[PDB]
Design a protein around this ligand. Sequence first.
Ligand SMILES: Nc1ncnc2c1ncn2[C@@H]1O[C@H](COP(=O)(O)NP(=O)(O)O)[C@@H](O)[C@H]1O
Ligand SMILES: Nc1ncnc2c1ncn2[C@@H]1O[C@H](COP(=O)(O)NP(=O)(O)O)[C@@H](O)[C@H]1O
Ligand SMILES: [Cl-]
Ligand SMILES: [Cl-]
Ligand SMILES: [Cl-]
Ligand SMILES: [Mg+2]
Ligand SMILES: [Mg+2]
Lengths: 360, 360
Amino acid sequence: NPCEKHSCIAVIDAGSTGSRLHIYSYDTDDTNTPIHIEEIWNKKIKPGFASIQPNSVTIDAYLTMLLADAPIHNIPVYFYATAGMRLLPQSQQKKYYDELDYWFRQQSQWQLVEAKTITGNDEALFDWLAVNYKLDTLKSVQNKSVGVMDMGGASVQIVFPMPKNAEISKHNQVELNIYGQNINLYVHSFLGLGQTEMSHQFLNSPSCFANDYPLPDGESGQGNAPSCKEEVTSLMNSVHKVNQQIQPLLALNPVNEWYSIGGISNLASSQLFHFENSELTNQSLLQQGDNQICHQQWDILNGQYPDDEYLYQYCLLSSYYYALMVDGYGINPNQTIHYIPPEQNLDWTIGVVLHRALEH
Amino acid sequence: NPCEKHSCIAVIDAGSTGSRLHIYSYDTDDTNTPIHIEEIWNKKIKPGFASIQPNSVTIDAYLTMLLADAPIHNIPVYFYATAGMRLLPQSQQKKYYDELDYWFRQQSQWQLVEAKTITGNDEALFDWLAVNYKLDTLKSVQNKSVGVMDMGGASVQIVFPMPKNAEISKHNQVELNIYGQNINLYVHSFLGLGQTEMSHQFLNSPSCFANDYPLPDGESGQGNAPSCKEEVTSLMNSVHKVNQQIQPLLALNPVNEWYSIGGISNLASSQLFHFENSELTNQSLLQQGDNQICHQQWDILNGQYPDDEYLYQYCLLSSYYYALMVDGYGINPNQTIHYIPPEQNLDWTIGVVLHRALEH
Ligand SMILES: Nc1ncnc2c1ncn2[C@@H]1O[C@H](COP(=O)(O)NP(=O)(O)O)[C@@H](O)[C@H]1O
Ligand SMILES: Nc1ncnc2c1ncn2[C@@H]1O[C@H](COP(=O)(O)NP(=O)(O)O)[C@@H](O)[C@H]1O
Ligand SMILES: [Cl-]
Ligand SMILES: [Cl-]
Ligand SMILES: [Cl-]
Ligand SMILES: [Mg+2]
Ligand SMILES: [Mg+2]
């Protein structure tokens, strides 16, 4: 039992496409800040919590499945939901949390401490903490700016260092104290621009699917990634005004190294894309999507690569990552974007270990 | 039992926000075309079938709830799913239908004939048939053009008479033969432009919510229907190009009478909006939404009208309907739009009674 000699907590990423339970062990330094954070248990379940029926039978089955087989008793649990839950009004969220609270009161293995929806700004802070913890950049003052992007299913987050700016909403800025240093961050989360939500506006766009892919409207795919990218850019910028919000800030506060987590890590490490050193450029991601997916014959490609359930979306998703990064955030197409390998099972929940407070 | 003296079938509208079972009795005319169609049972369930987990336990609970208490058995069932199902790839849809087929084969009260996803053009044809059947306009050649709009949760449909054009996709044209007359219709369905899907792009727009409504991102509502409308128009036209696709065709094929079904019927007949004769104009709809919802103090308005779960969305939804009809379709703001009263339980399923063929 690691938890008899180290602190342990359980954090659940109740994300839009699935829930991920992690039990972390850790020690603390002389200010009671966690160090030596190690994942000692994990379990994932699909679909997203906020997609299932909020009735006792269904919620019981789902929590029972997520929380089974753990070899440690009486661990405190922090259940934190993200953008899937944030699509729902507070009265509907309440139904889920009342049922989850009841479930936890009927059992004796886990100790529920908190179950709630976090804000997108909370989620972005945790995204930056998680990646910077893994990079070992938190303990000392850095001379390089690290930006993080989390490519989720219901929202996307961008977070990067920026001094306090009295002309920007308080909600898009966080003053972080961690290991005795003060870090000021810009945070933004874009609700509805996550993969799943975005994709529901383009399912009948022939440019976004392999040739002859059967679109729901009965038309055929006719892939063309630059064209698909321009369609996604219209949602990015004509609808959400990503470019107007983000690019002036990055122009004055440039990021020196970009790291990404979320679906782009899974795409870029699939059998269909080919990148070295766990990094990509947007130029190469669009080119590979266009040649290896968009302009292929769908039945031929699907027969060649039968095991990847995201295959049919890779023309759209490569186009969409480029639209978000290059046309929305203004990142140069040749700038290196590091992505964290999916096998590391890194998500924002490491940030909760380090920093318990949430926006009030 | 009316089905001992008349033909009966059951049709389920498996819509994006819920399923509606209808049992219809009818007679037939000399060509075996239904007449005297009467709804003799109705039951509705939430949420949408394509939203629940596709496992036997949950599908069986859902079907059991929908098809219980029905006063009539041993009748044929047509289960037709719409845009909620169309969001999913065929392999995911198959999991739902394989489980649904198994449930039906395991019982003896209902005879399943077909369970499938219909296309948006099929849905549009059935929308038009259903409204014109109720209007008594199918048996004779009409001297006025009747247009129909269905304001759904995952897609919206428009359908109106249009002589055959060799320049338009045959996917968007249908030649309908009914009661011995031939009617040429333009059909179009816009996937992703239904209420629920649309709304996920605007939940953090302060113009789309009452003053001080708590947006998910922590900012406050600051409602203004004309400004909310302009945001939704960017999705309509910069992303989906609704105007370019629809306006030139209506300019040349004017509709003399517009009828709408779907969520606009519910909003227009709520306690928050005030229209006579089950009709509205877009100018009045936008003005009522702006002054009765958008510019109100949220807590005060919510306290005044506690019993309508759609209240918080009415600033957005009135703005959206106007953006769709005026800025998308090109309909004059001053034009009367009839809405079918919700009490009538009219949906596209009457069209299936009349016309069994689906797009091949
Ligand atoms: N192979 C793959 N290619 C691209 N995206 C992939 C993938 N495997 C998972 N994903 C995507 O990762 C995303 C993970 O996001 P989530 O954490 O589930 N959503 P949120 O609560 O952060 O908004 C999903 O969109 C999922 O579909
Ligand atoms: N009071 C109300 N105001 C506005 N919209 C209301 C409402 N009551 C139901 N609705 C809406 O009707 C629509 C009915 O659509 P569905 O038939 O569920 N969706 P689809 O399969 O046709 O795409 C939903 O968006 C639902 O939320
Ligand atoms: Cl479910
Ligand atoms: Cl469609
Ligand atoms: Cl948010
Ligand atoms: Mg996530
Ligand atoms: Mg419908």
